[PDB]
Amino acid sequence: SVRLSGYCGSPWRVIGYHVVVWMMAGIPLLLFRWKPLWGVRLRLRPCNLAHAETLVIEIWQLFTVQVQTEVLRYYLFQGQRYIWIETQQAFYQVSLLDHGRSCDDVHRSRHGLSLQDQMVRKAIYGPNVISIPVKSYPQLLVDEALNPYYGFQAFSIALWLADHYYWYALCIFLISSISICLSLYKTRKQSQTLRDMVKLSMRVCVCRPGGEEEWVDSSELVPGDCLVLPQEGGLMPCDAALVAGECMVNESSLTGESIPVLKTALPEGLGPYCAETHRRHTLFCGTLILQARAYVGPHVLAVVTRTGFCTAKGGLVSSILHPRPINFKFYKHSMKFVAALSVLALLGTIYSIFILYRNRVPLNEIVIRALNLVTVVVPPALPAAMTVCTLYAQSRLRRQGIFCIHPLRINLGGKLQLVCFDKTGTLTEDGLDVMGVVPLKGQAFLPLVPEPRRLPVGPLLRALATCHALSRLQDTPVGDPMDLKMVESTGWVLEDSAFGTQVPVPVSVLHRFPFSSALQRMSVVVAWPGATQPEAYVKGSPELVAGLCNPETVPTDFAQMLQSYTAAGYRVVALASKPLPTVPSLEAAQQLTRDTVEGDLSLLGLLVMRNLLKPQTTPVIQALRRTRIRAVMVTGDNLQTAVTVARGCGMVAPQEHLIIVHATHPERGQPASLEFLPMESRSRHLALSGPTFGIIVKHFPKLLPKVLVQGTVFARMAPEQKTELVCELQKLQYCVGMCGDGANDCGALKAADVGISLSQAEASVVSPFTSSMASIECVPMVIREGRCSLDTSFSVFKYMALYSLTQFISVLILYTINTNLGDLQFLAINLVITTTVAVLMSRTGPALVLGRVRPPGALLSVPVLSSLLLQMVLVTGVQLGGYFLTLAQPWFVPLNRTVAAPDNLPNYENTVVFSLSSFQYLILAAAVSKGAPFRRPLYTNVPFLVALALLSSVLVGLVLVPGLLQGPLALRNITDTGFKLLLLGLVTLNFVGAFMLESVLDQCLPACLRRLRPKRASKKRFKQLERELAEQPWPP
């Protein structure tokens, strides 16, 4: 639901709010950006909605929009207009102003729209542009640099500069600048992609009232305006309803289907016009009209219906710009994790205050010594690391051909638990391939002929090459893909309609009755030179055609062969012929009725057509089902063809039962009945239909979960029932992700948590993901990279936690002995080592196989916290060992406690602690990068391995080479070399210890975790249903 609230303006309250927020503190601003309702309530006085100058749109989410005027007083929410309807005293969207007008009104608006009315409709409906907002670089900076994170970073910069650590402040400024430039680049790239995608502006002629055709801009169209389409065609500027002629629209930009479409005129009547009912008569926005022709009148007319964000492209782009929140939260208990790690920072700050009180430090300096130690545990390179993870994920995906528009969907692509599929184009080849035609020799069937070219010239070959409705569109046949394929198999070329022999007289079409879905058959009138009389060829459903055929012509084995072909996934169409005593001429042929031609036929043969399975589909389905990711087929084809594809493409192993569930329609006096009829060739599937699924949704919402938990084949599903089913599967807490390609799928590719549009261009609005390949090989390529990304994010968070705690423990061990870490040593640690490593750690790709082990989803998980705590105990052990070992050395002399750093610094203690700590960082960085089973191993991204090698070598130089950078960094020059080798031995001990500890945890700890307290039950609803079914199977 939503809610509105008016806030009539007043300047005194506004200026009071501004001065209070600016003078008081940033904390009120922080709680405001966390609780904006209180902030907006304090800013301005509530008022009646008819007096508003500011709204509060709610979805509960909070948005603030401004009511503006031009009386017309309107506001734009998410780009959709809403206007002030005076009579109803409410804000009604503009998509609902004229919504509900009849086709007769659309036809009446054919004469156009007068300029005096066009100005009114342009005031109401606004400009006909999908205006992606343009934000200047200052606006972007105010967007990102006002984050409380960067506010705290600037506070820390000032805090350090007030301590004369200039180089560390420069370091923090440079890292925050890099983070801001990265965020700005990401945002600008997304906005540039969208603004490039939806940029169209042209000049289109407009039908003025009275017939004075006027040319105007494409940004000055209004619903109700009449638009004349160029005879040669062109890009379409706005949705429209055809009111004359036919069109050839290439709707790939809107629905991802590149095949030309026939768009006929609008059928008259008093039925209110619908964008879905009359979807054959509507020309959408952004679709490239190939060629349009006018049958009556000199020009083809379209009456605009939707302009701007109201259109189909406008709606999809409003969805892309303002995506709905993601339901599955990737980092669960992340706040509790950072709290369980901030308790450590608080304990350390207590120790700091205590030991600096004990060290007789000035209180004004104790406050700084504590605030610095607090700001150490806030890593300046956290946003940089996160956005670099997302950028690397996007780039790895784009490098294969998968084009993710907004990168936050990859993490969802990682934890997929269900994957739906189309069938035609996704699993099986897009176009039907004919297996051949079986001819008749008297009253018996002849062996199947794979090549119709080898058929001798006769009624069968002529029917194959002529009985169709193909038309040449720009020197290219267009029409039904089935008919086009059955034509190209014969080798004949279209030249009324005449056809030339492949290698044998041309064949002419005297008359043709168009195919009808209700009649499920079609007939034509065919004549050729040298023929005594024209012949009629009929193609349609074989059982219906055979009825019209002569009983003595139909073989007695017709039914058995038909059953054997149809149940095998083939699509068989019957071809029949009959002589016509009509004189060969176009005049008499045009008078033939369809009823006369259809009757009294002679069966020529059966044309068998197969839809082959792509070679890349079976391995993908097997590698999705051996990783326990359910695979479902949501198709709109037959149920037997779907079942045969699914059983062939690995969705149903030969030993898994598939129980076709059938729901009989509830007649008068009886309810709906579920009857289960199985099939003869996890452990049980169900193959619903479209009507059966609708019946089970309506009547039996109790037996619906046990149908969506084990149902595999969903055939005869209407384009809206695919979305129905995807939503119903999400209601069982599946992370379903659909992978379809055509125009039927684009309804569900939005509802699915990860939609992949199989065959696309560089990008499109149809679905979050796309792809530039034809096979479903891109579903594993998305799941693998989603797992790699969802694991890289955990690795980077863990490294930032470990690297902050290590630096904080180091600074504490130094504060205890009354030293600090210096000025250039902080710069080294937080820029050269840690930022480099954190931004190169995310570069290593995904694994090359899909594993049965799903990545974690919790940051507070006891593996993660046990790892952090054990790594930190080991690091603190190594640093305290180094310190307590530099004491026992003979050449040791303690520092001057009478002064604090950087005065007493350099000294031996700071030298030892920094030397160990700078290695601690690289060791934890290589210890948290775990390749198996999600990522490719560490050495397989040469930037990271070379970074680790160069930094380890440089630090070993610092430890071993005298005078090497020991002046700028202020490291005391240790003369002894045996103690240097002892420090390196302690470093290597920590290296081995960290790697061994991580291996021991990752291997053994899960077993003890299972044994100590096994999971009693799973929160997933589908998991509870799966257990309930394994205990007792539902369909008996």
Ligand SMILES: CC(C)CCC[C@@H](C)[C@H]1CC[C@H]2[C@@H]3CC=C4C[C@@H](OC(=O)CCC(=O)O)CC[C@]4(C)[C@H]3CC[C@]12C
């Ligand atoms: C002073 C020194 C020692 C600090 C080192 C910092 C660099 C190692 C970091 C800072 C930001 C990082 C960059 C941040 C983000 C990107 C992601 C990536 O960009 C793309 O994905 C290409 C986009 C496209 O072509 O579509 C390439 C690496 C790069 C520039 C990173 C490379 C390493 C950079 C330059």
Ligand code: ALF
């Ligand atoms: F086979 Al489809 F939508 F392409 F069901």
